[PDB]
């Protein structure tokens, strides 16, 4: 199995700079939505993606999940070390969603409100859980999935890599030929619904699909940095 991918990142129409970072290679897809004043979010997302990049070089083998886990923790430690060197960066952090492929298996690591999706046999499923305030309220039965869509704090992030102790979610999944994956920052999914994302993901060529996702986000106002990685598994 091989990966045919397209990655696209845009500042949007509002923000002064782009604090999303993204990696896409032969076996690793990774997306980090950074935050922090004075472009410190660029630093956090860069540091975490750089720590994961080496996972692209070799077949993971036995402990694919432990290797993903170690890379994420190494990125988180790099943030802590960078804050030590320049204490004015305190507060900076980033989400991370990444998939590492190994034949008919993949490892998924996730923290924050970036998203991973699978499109398989015409059906779209979100394979990550949002660390947002509305997700906390849904888990407690305080609101319904429907009221979450209009809640003023619906994009509010509750957990991220900030250089402190963290436990990201690690999942092993089955991967199939014909699958299409999407990684995205909340700059896509805040303005664009899953119904619309699905239509864009059925565009045959991966680069045209990714372009369309960015276009739709910008048509919804482009309030945030928007980043996507669209990838196909083929024979
Ligand atoms: Mn950001
Ligand atoms: Mn958000
Ligand atoms: Mn964002």
Swiss-Prot record:
Role summary: Plays an important role in regulating cell division and growth by reversible phosphorylation signaling. May play important roles in regulating cellular metabolism and signaling pathways, which could mediate the growth and development of the cell. Plays a role in establishing and maintaining infection.
Protein name: Serine/threonine protein phosphatase PstP
Gene of this entry: pstP
Chain ranges on the Cytoplasmic side, renumbered to this chain: 1-235
Residues engaged in binding Mn(2+) 3: 113, 155, 186
GO MF assignments: metal ion binding; protein serine/threonine phosphatase activity
Binding annotation for Mn(2+) 1: 33-34
Cellular-component GO terms for this entry: plasma membrane
Binding site for Mn(2+) 2: 33, 186, 224
PPM-type phosphatase domain location: 4-233
Ribonucleoprotein is among the record's keywords: no
UniProtKB keywords: Cell membrane, Hydrolase, Manganese, Membrane, Metal-binding, Protein phosphatase, Transmembrane, Transmembrane helix
Protein location: Cell membrane
């Amino acid at each position: 199995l091989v990966l045919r991918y397209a990655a696209r990142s845009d500042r949007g129409l509002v923000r002064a700079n782009n604090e999303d970072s993204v990696y896409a290679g032969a076996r690793l897809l990774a997306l980090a939505d950074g935050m922090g004043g004075h472009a410190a979010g660029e630093v956090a997302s860069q540091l975490v993606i750089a720590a994961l990049a080496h996972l692209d070089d070799d077949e993971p083998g036995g402990d694919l999940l432990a290797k993903l886990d170690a890379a994420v923790r190494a990125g988180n430690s790099a943030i802590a070390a960078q804050v030590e060197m320049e204490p004015d960066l305190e507060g900076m952090g980033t989400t991370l969603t990444a998939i590492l492929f190994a034949g008919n298996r993949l490892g998924l690591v996730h923290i924050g409100d970036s998203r991973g999706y699978l499109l398989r046999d015409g059906e779209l499923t979100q394979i990550t859980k949002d660390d947002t305030f509305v997700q906390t309220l849904v888990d407690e039965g305080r609101i319904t999935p429907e009221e979450a869509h209009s809640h003023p704090q619906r994009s509010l992030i509750m957990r991220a890599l900030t250089g402190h102790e963290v436990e990201p979610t690690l999942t092993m999944r089955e991967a199939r030929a014909g699958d299409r994956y999407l990684l995205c920052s909340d700059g896509l999914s805040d303005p664009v619904s899953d119904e619309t994302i699905l239509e864009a993901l059925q565009i045959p060529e991966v680069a045209e699909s990714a372009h369309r996702l960015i276009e739709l986000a910008l048509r919804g106002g482009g309030p945030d940095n928007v980043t996507v990685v669209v990838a196909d598994l083929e024979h």
